[PDB]
Amino acid sequence: MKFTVEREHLLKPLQQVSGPLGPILGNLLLQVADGTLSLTGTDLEMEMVARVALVQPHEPGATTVPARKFFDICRGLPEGAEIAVQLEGERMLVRSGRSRFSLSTLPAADFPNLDDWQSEVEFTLPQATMKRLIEATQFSMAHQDVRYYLNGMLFETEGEELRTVATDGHRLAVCSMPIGQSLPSHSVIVPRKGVIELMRMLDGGDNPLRVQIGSNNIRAHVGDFIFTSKLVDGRFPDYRRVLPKNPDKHLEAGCDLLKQAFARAAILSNEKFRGVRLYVSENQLKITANNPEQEEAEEILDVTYSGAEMEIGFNVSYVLDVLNALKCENVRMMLTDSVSSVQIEDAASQSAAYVVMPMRL
């Protein structure tokens, strides 16, 4: 196996395939075949593959090498460097200028594959749209809940919309985007680690994303990268049951002003229960916090609100996470009563909605 490739063509692929990797699971599979260098990394649940066209002379074959070490060496070489690689006995030689490295290998035959599977649902969308969908909701996924089905993100197709849902059983995020195709009605749960890799492969370019979903797998193809993940089992909750039935009380406020006010008030909230009380009244919002030491914060903001007066308590971190994810000018808070969930949206778009539960203070 021999190839010679510019650093610039090798670096982004290596970065992508090597990022998550950690004995042969800590190596990248390199294969020279059909005019192409393929690089693959896996943790047995998901797999990233990059293809790189070889325009210089090359020789076929495959091996595996320590991913981090190989990435670090390539990244450490100067801009414009050419990287020549070849196999020698049990080692992989890497030469660039007068820099030389000999790395250990494990056999390509020992490198594990995901089980074969069949595509049942397929669609295309812009990368920016997938990016928006994941970024809108990803912060609301559980991390290591014993309900495994929450440690990931629902991807749902309905009509012409691709929708993401994430919840940790305390708060929820949902985002729907039209993608201009007639889609079957379907949903799957992508594990949180898979969601992070998928997000990270979105380069910021114009190449559309192609998505393939099977009964137990999802695949995303963008440019010369192919990501594959296993899916999570279990019944994901229904966001329509979490969204309030009819949140007819509508408050609108500047997103950054609201964020700042909540973050200041939070300073004098209980460290155990970092909650704040909201008093909504005609065109005014009052936020208060207090703690065991009898310390007290109060913030008063102008808002647009016509509706009955009410008081409701929230976890401040959940509201700040939402406001930070919206990145908007104005927010709409849609209220029911003092003991029911609140829905929050960008005042200028219904494309994403967030649900937070009231908090006993």
Ligand X SMILES: NC(=O)Cn1c2c(c3cc(Cl)ccc31)CC[C@@H](C(=O)O)C2
Neighbours of 280 (CB within 10 A): 21
The two tokens of residue 300 are: 């008063």
Min dist CB 342 to Cl ion, Å, is 21
Spatial CB neighbours of 21, under 8 Å, sequence gap ≥ 6: 27, 28, 41, 43, 67, 68
* Binding piece for Cl ion, criterion CB under 5 A, among 78-86, 116-124, 309-317, 349-357: 78-86
Q: Map tokens 């949180």 to a residue.
A: 192
Q: Which does 237 bind (CB under 5 to 8 A by kind): its own copies, ligand X, Ca ion, none?
A: ligand X
How far, in Å, CA of 225 to CA of 5, rounded? 17
Min dist CB 293 to its own copies, Å, is 5
* Binding piece for Ca ion, criterion CB under 5 A, among 21-29, 31-39, 82-90, 94-102: 82-90
* Binding piece for Cl ion, criterion CB under 5 A, among 163-171, 256-264, 302-310, 327-335: 256-264
The two tokens of residue 233 are: 């089992």
If binding is defined by CB under 8 A, does position 272 make contact with its own copies? Answer: no
E runs forming strands in 13-129: 27-33, 36-42, 46-53, 61-66, 82-88, 91-96, 99-104, 121-125
Tell which residue, 240, 233, 246, 236, has the closest CA to residue 166.
Answer: 236
What does the chain come to in residues?
361
1 vs 165 by CB, closer to ligand X: 165
If binding is defined by CB under 5 A, does position 78 make contact with Cl ion? Answer: yes
If binding is defined by CB under 5 A, does position 42 make contact with Ca ion? Answer: no
Q: What is the contact surface with ligand X in residues (CB under 6 A)?
A: 147, 150, 167, 169-172, 237, 242, 341, 355, 357
How far, in Å, CA of 99 to CA of 219, rounded? 38
Rule CB under 8 A: choose which of 2, 12, 69, 250 binds its own copies.
69
How far, in Å, CA of 322 to CA of 64, rounded? 43
Measure CA 203 to chain center: 13
The two tokens of residue 22 are: 């950690």
* Binding piece for its own copies, criterion CB under 8 A, among 9-17, 134-142, 259-267, 272-280: 259-267
Rule CB under 8 A: choose which of 263, 328, 357, 359 binds its own copies.
263
How far, in Å, CA of 256 to CA of 301, rounded? 12
Min dist CB 318 to ligand X, Å, is 9
Q: Give yes or no for a contact between 198 and 130, defined as CB atoms under 8 angstroms apart.
A: yes
Identify residues 259-278 at the interface with Cl ion (CB under 5 A).
260
How far, in Å, CA of 141 to CA of 171, rounded? 9
Spatial CB neighbours of 256, under 8 Å, sequence gap ≥ 6: none
Rule CB under 8 A: choose which of 8, 55, 59, 72 binds its own copies.
72
| Runs of H (alpha helix) within 304-352 | 316-326
Residue with CB nearest Cl ion?
A: 260
Q: Which does 155 bind (CB under 5 to 8 A by kind): Ca ion, its own copies, Cl ion, none?
A: none
* Binding piece for its own copies, criterion CB under 8 A, among 51-59, 99-107, 116-124, 353-361: 99-107
Tell which residue, 62, 69, 44, 58, has the closest CA to residue 107.
Answer: 62
Min dist CB 337 to its own copies, Å, is 25
203 vs 256 by CB, closer to Cl ion: 256
Min dist CB 77 to its own copies, Å, is 7
Q: Which does 296 bind (CB under 5 to 8 A by kind): Ca ion, its own copies, Cl ion, none?
A: its own copies
If binding is defined by CB under 5 A, does position 27 make contact with Ca ion? Answer: no
106 vs 150 by CB, closer to ligand X: 150
Rule CB under 5 A: choose which of 176, 212, 330, 343 binds Ca ion.
176
Helix (H, G, I), strand (E, B) or coil at 149: helix
Query: From residue 188, how far is each of 153, 154, 272 by CA, in Å?
Result: 8, 6, 35
Q: Which does 297 bind (CB under 5 to 8 A by kind): its own copies, Ca ion, ligand X, none?
A: its own copies
Footprint of Ca ion (CB under 5 A): 90, 176
Footprint of Cl ion (CB under 5 A): 78, 260
